[PDB]
């Protein structure tokens, strides 16, 4: 029937989505940005694993219909994501085959994040921003680890880049770098490979 | 025999100074002699039933029962007769008034004259069999007096709903009266002679007019005055005296009142001009100048000066160098007045014209940075330009404001002290935006988020330009005929439109809103080259005067968007991040501060780290509307800090001034992981910050003794009820700064005990009375909660918060005076709760369908006892003060504690001997509710099980707080059936410990599928100590507990019952 | 005769200016009609 498709392809969605440690009391900024963060990812990974589960076993299984679980099949059949999933930035209201991918680009960056915090060393890291729920939050915290390790005023701390905190994952549009010297060209977008950014108070 | 003679002696008493007591008949007007002095009845009636009351309980009440019982239903039969006497006779006077001044009503209404003349006589009766016998048991001896006055309030109402379509001609007489309400008028034409009653409605009217300066004859206005105290003489006073109509010196004194704010802004700008010639100024010339006008007045020649000195300067750098020095000189010398302690109303006007000469200072240093060389340059010409030309015969149109390609005149309407908006660059955008679009004639339109100053802006360019505004916060039940009445009262009175959320209202009325627009903006081209234009089909005058604009928000709470006709009538202008900084600055250098710059380039960017780094929350505002609250907050506690200083110049910890007002405004908003955050953020910001909180022995200790009072454990912070009493300080705090308050947070945290304890204590130290109204506003409709216009016949009737906001307002039993707290005991949510976005605003008025602006004494506090604020956008969010109640704070011994202390005092069946068995069982079950023991690791347990329906703590607290009641009703009803054997107490004991058992399970597992309540069960079993029945098969609910303190098997109670032939299935 | 449809005396403006339209012959027009279509229809059949 289509529940059988609908739990074949049910199946075939959360291989990529398995598991995220919980790993707080520590003074840097980093460090509970990332503990918070780990948080609540394993707790959308753990409530986006039990739905999943909740409806496998509502399709084939002695297990029945709920309002909540007409919702979820209705929602998944029509493709579109339910509103309890969407709890993190989607432009526009993507589908949910490309959501689940970007969700396990999350995950496995939180576990990659959970297993540099289990050993600064979480300076040492490399982050591409577009998979944390809140890149301003980890701008702030930079600032306010760069602010707390060298005394400095937070008013005027301005950004100096380069192509002491490495990012990645960064898409320009419509131009290139060299020598960190910008470039016209019609290519409609390059990937950064790395960006520094250093706290310069002037 | 005593103490029971003492207590009918305090009966005699009462007696004798209840015979004392009499009605004060005054004669009114060589009419009739009424009674006055109401609410020392009023306190005589309600002290003497709390009397009663209070010797009703204890302890030699029970012998001199017939005679206190006979004084209680006397004074209630005297309470709710003369209750209903004193709206009768309040009805009749401006109705009696109303009758005799006006004209021409005979041979209009003629049944109405009749009834009324009928009515008059029998209440002259009335006022002679008074006046014969004043006593008020006299008075009361008349027998069917209740049935006369309700049949004479009846009347009363009758013809005042028949009268009401009289009002509307004389609303087409004075134009302001199109602002008031039908009661409100009615008392208006009523009492012109007295006059007196009229002083509390010129609020309503006028901007800044709350009562006439009266001459002792009554018949002289002196002038007028504003509700700061600030008072403007007349130079020709109106004559009353020579008898015109009410809305002949009504005119008078609105045309009377622009003359001569004309003329003190001629003479005050004369005493600037010949101030301003000087390089060096003396500060006590400067500061009596300061005393001598008005704070409008003063601000508006300061503008004019600044603007002719800078016009000189640009006739032509040097010039406009010397314009700069002096108005740095003036800045140093307003700094140095107002660094010291001052009266508060020439220290307001300290503060207008501080921000008003830095904004100069600003907009002079924006010109000087670049080369200027004519006044026809546009940079000069981007900003405001006032011209004042002494050669001008007409004082009203001597004044004129020249903004770019724009000109106009002031409409001279007195405001009073009001508040002073911050020339930033985006409101000089928006002054410069909204004035192109009003020269034009057109129609003004902001739009953003919530938290920009949108409205503010907007009112503050009306008080600039002088213009009368009126702020309007329109609903879906405004409709075409509320709309075109409001729009004519604006046409008639030439006052600009504020109207607020206009996005929902109801597409095809806002589409047949347009036509109206359309209309009022052709009327306006045609002044702009005997103007009239067509309003509900009526051609009627139009004041030069007229502007609308158009607060909106796109997609708050999902509202409807404008039609593209009457978006074209509308300019649009986008804020979406003001200036934070420069506000910031001004602010702290207008409260007087030394390292003010500091302060704010240490605040707005602890702002933007504390908007991001807290977690995301419903109830979460970091923008500007919370910082200005922040700001004024820290200016009181730094002059209250001065004065402490003072109490027993020099420098003060202004750090430490602004962390403890940051603390005590947003600590309360937080939940449990967000405090040590903002604690780290006031860390690495401030490095010097510390803080300080309590200090409040006074309040606690009464709050501690009216917890004990009424079955509440007190805590003394660390304790087990601390974190509760800490919230209650923190609810008073919010009570003391903030005007309407969220108590946010999940259900069983106590908060509606809280507002309860918080209001009894205040009672209890300030010595006011605090009244509160509870209402849910989901119980009934948003037609029934704010009130219905009827579209036959335009009437206005009450909602239930109407009713509620009209009876504080009225006041007639002395409601001002004593605490008011309006509880909304509901969920929050954008339907209802965006009709009050202008109460628990700076407007602090609330607005009606029908013109009838209700604005809202301060002694009102608007509160809420909610769930969660999610479903509510941020126009109701970041307009109040959060204060949340985490789940955690009321802990589960609380609730113990609370249920054995009702158990031992307050006996069941409402000293008994039953009551000594409640007590015998609160003493053992008291080692089974405390520390962990069996009821906490049980309901631990619990949460971790599933059940049918969402299980929290209360449901089932409550659930084995009756089964624990039943039980002791169970054993006082053994000890009834038993009289020669009582209840043993080794039995009791053996009984208690097995019936708490199988009333947790019952209780925890009553709720869910028999294997659950089963594993339930064994884990009973498994865990406490207690006897058990030795069955590890049978589970413990499928026993019951005896009057013998053993079990009992269910299944050995159920029989083996056959049934007859008759009755085989039957229901 | 510019006429904008959502209010019950917008509908009566309508249709006296359509009456007087059809015996004088001047224009009448309706702005933003899309917010009543039950009176759409009958403005549609009685044109008709
Ligand atoms: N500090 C306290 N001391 C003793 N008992 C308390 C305390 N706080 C709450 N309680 C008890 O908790 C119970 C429920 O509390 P309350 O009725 O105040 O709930 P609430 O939080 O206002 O509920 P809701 O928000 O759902 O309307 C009552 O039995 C009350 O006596
Ligand atoms: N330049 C300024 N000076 C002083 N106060 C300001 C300024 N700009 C904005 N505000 C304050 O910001 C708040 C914004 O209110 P707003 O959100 O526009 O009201 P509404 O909810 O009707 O949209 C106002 O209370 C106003 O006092
Ligand atoms: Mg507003
Ligand atoms: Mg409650």
Redesign the pocket.
Known sequence: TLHTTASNWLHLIPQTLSHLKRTENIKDPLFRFFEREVKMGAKLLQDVRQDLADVVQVCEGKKKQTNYLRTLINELVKGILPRSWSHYTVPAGMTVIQWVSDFSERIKQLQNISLAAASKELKNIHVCLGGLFVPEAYITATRQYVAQANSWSLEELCLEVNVSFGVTGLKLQGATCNNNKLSLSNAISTALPLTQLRWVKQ | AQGEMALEEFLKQIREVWNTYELDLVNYQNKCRLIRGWDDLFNKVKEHINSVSAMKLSPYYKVFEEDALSWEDKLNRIMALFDVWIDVQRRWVYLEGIFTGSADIKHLLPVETQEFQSISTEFLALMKKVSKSPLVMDVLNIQGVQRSLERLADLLGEIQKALGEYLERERSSFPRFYFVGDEDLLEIIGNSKNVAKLQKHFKKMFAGVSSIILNEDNSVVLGISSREGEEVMFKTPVSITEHPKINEWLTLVEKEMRVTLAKLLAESVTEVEIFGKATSIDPNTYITWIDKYQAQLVVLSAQIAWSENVETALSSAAPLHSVLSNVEVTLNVLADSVLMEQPPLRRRKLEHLITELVHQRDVTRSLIKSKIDNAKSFEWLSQMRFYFDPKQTDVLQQLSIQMANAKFNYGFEYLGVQDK??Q?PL?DRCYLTMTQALEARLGGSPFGP????????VKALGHQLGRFVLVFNCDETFDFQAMGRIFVGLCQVGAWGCF?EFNRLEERMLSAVSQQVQCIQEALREHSNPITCELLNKQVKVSPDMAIFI?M?PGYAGRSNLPDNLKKLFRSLAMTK?DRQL?AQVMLYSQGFRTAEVLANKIVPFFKLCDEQLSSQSHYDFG??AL?SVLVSAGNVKRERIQKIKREAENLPEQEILIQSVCETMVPKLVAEDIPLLFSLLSDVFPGVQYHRGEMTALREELKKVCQEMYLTYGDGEEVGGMWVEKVLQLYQITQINHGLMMVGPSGSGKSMAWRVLLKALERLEGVEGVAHIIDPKAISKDHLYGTLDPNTREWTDGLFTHVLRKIIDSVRGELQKRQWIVFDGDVDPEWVENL?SVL??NKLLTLPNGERLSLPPNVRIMFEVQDLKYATL?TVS?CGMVWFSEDVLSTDMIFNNFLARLRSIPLDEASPMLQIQRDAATIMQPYFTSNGLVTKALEHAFQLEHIMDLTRLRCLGSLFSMLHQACRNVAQYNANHPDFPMQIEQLERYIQRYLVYAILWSLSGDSRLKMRAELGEYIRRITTVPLPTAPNIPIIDYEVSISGEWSPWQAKVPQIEVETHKVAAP | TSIAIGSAEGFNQADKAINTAVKSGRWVMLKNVHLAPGWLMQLEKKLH
Do not use: F, M, Q
């Not at chain 2, 919530?450 to 802006?457: N, P, Q």
């Open positions: 908006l911050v930033t409101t919530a938290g920009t100053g949108k409205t503010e802006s607020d607060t928000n003001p506000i500007l509307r200005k976005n605003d700076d126009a307009r």
